[PDB]
Amino acid sequence: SRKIAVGIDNESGGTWTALNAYFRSGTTDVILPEFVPNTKALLYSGRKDTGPVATGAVAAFAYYMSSGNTLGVMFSVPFDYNWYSNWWDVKIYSGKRRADQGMYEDLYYGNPYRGDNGWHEKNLGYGLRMKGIMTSAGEAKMQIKISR
Amino acid sequence: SRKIAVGIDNESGGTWTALNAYFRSGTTDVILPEFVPNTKALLYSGRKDTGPVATGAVAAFAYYMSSGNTLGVMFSVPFDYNWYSNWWDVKIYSGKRRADQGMYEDLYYGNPYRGDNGWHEKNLGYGLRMKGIMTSAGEAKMQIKISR
Amino acid sequence: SRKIAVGIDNESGGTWTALNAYFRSGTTDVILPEFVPNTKALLYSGRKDTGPVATGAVAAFAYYMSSGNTLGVMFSVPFDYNWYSNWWDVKIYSGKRRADQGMYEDLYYGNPYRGDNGWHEKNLGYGLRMKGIMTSAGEAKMQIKISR
Amino acid sequence: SRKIAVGIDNESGGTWTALNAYFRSGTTDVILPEFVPNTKALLYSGRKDTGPVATGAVAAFAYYMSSGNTLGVMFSVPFDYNWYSNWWDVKIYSGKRRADQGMYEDLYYGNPYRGDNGWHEKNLGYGLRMKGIMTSAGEAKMQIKISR
Amino acid sequence: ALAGTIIAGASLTFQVLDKVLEELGKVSRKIAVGIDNESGGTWTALNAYFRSGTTDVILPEFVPNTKALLYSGRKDTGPVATGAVAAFAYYMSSGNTLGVMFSVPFDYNWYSNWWDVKIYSGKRRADQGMYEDLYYGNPYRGDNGWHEKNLGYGLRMKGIMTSAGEAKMQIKISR
């Protein structure tokens, strides 16, 4: 029983734009929202693919901000917490870059943020700062604040 | 445990009269909305054939813009994701083209769009530009904007 | 589980009076509406019979328009879609005509439109035109427009 | 499980007084309403409760008119359908005439309207006239228009 | 919304804790938590360590003056013999860390409810070490008898917690 709700507030002052949502595993029940302008939070959800499959909602979706950069946001909620673990990351890719498999790999192996309910912080650059958090539960809830 | 909910924008400036909805498999609990006027939305749906039958909800349906061209829109949610996979597509066809085995055949074997929950775009031509997505789950949502 | 909802819109310039609903098989739950006036849409339904017997829901019902003839409609949502298949049709008989086995045979062995969820058309004659559609589901629907 | 609904109106321009509800097999959950005068409608219910009852709601009820005569209205929705079927009829008897076993047999062996879900008409005489229908369903309905 | 949100400071009651319990759903070991900020400085959540168990609701961040934050914690789902023992930190405008904890073990036979509230000088990440300090320091029981102490940094805690496995923790952090 794995899933994750995701909510990303956009204080960047420029309207974003959905690109795609790669999934190492799992799927979603909701489309990737297209336009999430300033003073607005994207609401998205993913969940483990229905069925007796030992996999979680290991996903990563990009997003095109008005600054012309990829807002690659990942999240891993593995079916198994004994070996694997909850993780997430938000690293901006400059220019244009879809939510590729390689984009997810970079997010998950560069410096993924631990899923430990902690409000971890990083500065994405381009005058862009991230204030994010996700739970260590099997059904995780993530809050991101992409501000300037 | 598999279905598709299609929502299609109408910005083309002309109402699309529904022609038909050929289902290579599956059925539809909702009638195809005959009139989908300009600046509006079609809210269609497709359902897998109820009962223990190894089948998905794959169907290409057709709409007629005021420009006078068939708006053949396809989708597919195969029952066996092990072998097949999600595939959706949309191509304009000149004049009244009743969607059929040939329409779905070409749309699935033409330039179909992968169901990675990715927003894939292609200029439909005839002054029409497409912007749509399909999820990778058994349930699949579409938000296909058709703008002019 | 076999069912069908039939909705006929009466824009023929005159109300219709219910006549009969013969059922070669199946069974309905709601009575035929008495009078469907100008610019109003009829509502009706049939269903699987009162028990688990291997037979479908095939029925033809007639109305009497203000024009003085019989508007007969026939639908057939069978039990074995592998052998039989969905069908429907609608035609006008001059003068009063009761719905029965013969009228159902005529409407079902003439040009019965497929239930492929296609907005079929016909010129009913006597200054009357039909614009109809029905789904291929076991719990099929049906939307028909009758316009003068 | 064969419950039947019965609704019979009164457009004769006079008051309507309940006489009795003879039930040879099965008891209607409700009792016969007393006042359903001119420009008003009556409602009723069926009888297939109390478990082990084979034939259900196959009986007639008598309603007294302001004209001094009484109309017996029958209905018959037996569990058997290979040997029996849906049946119903209405008759008007001058003066006092209670619904009973003899009344039920007389109504059943007069001109019993076949329960083919067909609107049936008859001039009831005595300045009275009827347009009635009953579905062929085990979960039958009925509508009676008793206009002078 | 309801769980992991902020309401009026005077509105922090037992009933809202019951509502948070209801929102989390039917689980054996769980705890609703509610902390009122009378310190006069807006709080900022730091992190929520968990010795065991987890939470289905994120940790709310901004807890301004005359406002009370809420929170939910639940036992790890499944037949795993684990409880809900956790702690979390907030950052006040005074520049120090307000750490709190709460432990509702699965097995009341060998362990019992525990909780404690403290201030750590400056910024402190709620983690294994902070939880160990709070749990093996001067932890309060779940006796529901109102427990009062000063936090050692100009603040005092007016908090309380129940001994039931369906714990309902209330705190009034004040100067």
C-beta separation of B8 from B42 below 8 A = yes
Nearest Cα residue in chain A from E53: A137
Strand (E) or helix (H) holding A106: helix A101-110
Nearest Cα residue in chain D from C48: D137
Nearest Cα residue in chain C from B18: C119
How far apart are the C-alpha atoms of B20 and B100, rounded to whole Å? 9
C-beta separation of C115 from B21 below 8 A = no
Return the CATH number at C114. 2.60.270.20
Please, do chains B and A touch (3+ CB pairs < 8 Å)?
A: yes
Which conformational region is residue E171 in: left (phi greater than 0), alpha (psi within -120 to 50 degrees), or beta?
Answer: beta
Within 13 Å, how many C-alpha atoms sit on residue E67's CB side? 17
Q: What is the largest CA-CA distance in chain D?
A: 43
C-beta separation of D64 from D42 below 8 A = no
| Two structure tokens written together for D2 | 């064969």
- Name chain B contacts of C140, Cβ cutoff 8 Å: 27
How far apart are the C-alpha atoms of E4 and B96, rounded to whole Å? 56
* Dihedral, D101, D103, D109, D110 alpha carbons, nearest 10: 180
Print the domain residue range for C89: 1-148
How far apart are the C-alpha atoms of E165 and E108, rounded to whole Å? 8
D136 touches chain C (CB under 8 A): yes
Which residue pairs, CB below 8 angstroms and at least 24 apart, start in D123-129? D124/D71, D124/D90, D124/D91, D124/D92, D125/D92, D126/D67, D126/D69, D126/D92, D126/D94, D127/D12, D127/D67, D128/D12, D128/D65, D128/D67, D128/D71, D128/D92
Order of strands, sheet of A73-76, starting from the edge strand that comes earlier in the sequence: A18-23, A59-63, A73-76, A87-90, A113-114
Resolution of this model in Å is 3.8
Integer-rounded Cα radius of gyration of chain D: 14
Say which residues have a Cβ less than 8 Å from residue E136's Cβ, sequence separation at least 6: none
- How many domains would you assign to chain E? 1
| Closest among B95, B56, B88 to B74, alpha carbons compared | B88
Chain C interface test: which of D82, D136, D147 (most C C-beta within 10 Å): D136
Q: Nearest by CB to A117, from E48, E74, E77: name it.
A: E48
- Name chain C contacts of B36, Cβ cutoff 8 Å: none
- Name chain E contacts of A133, Cβ cutoff 8 Å: 58-59
Residues in chain A: 148
Pairing of strands C87-93, C35-36: unpaired
D10/chain C closest Cα distance in angstroms: 16
What residue type is B50 in one-letter code? T
Residues in chain C: 148
Order of strands, sheet of D59-65, starting from the edge strand that comes earlier in the sequence: D16-22, D59-65, D70-76, D87-93, D113-114
How far apart are the C-alpha atoms of A65 and A71, rounded to whole Å? 7
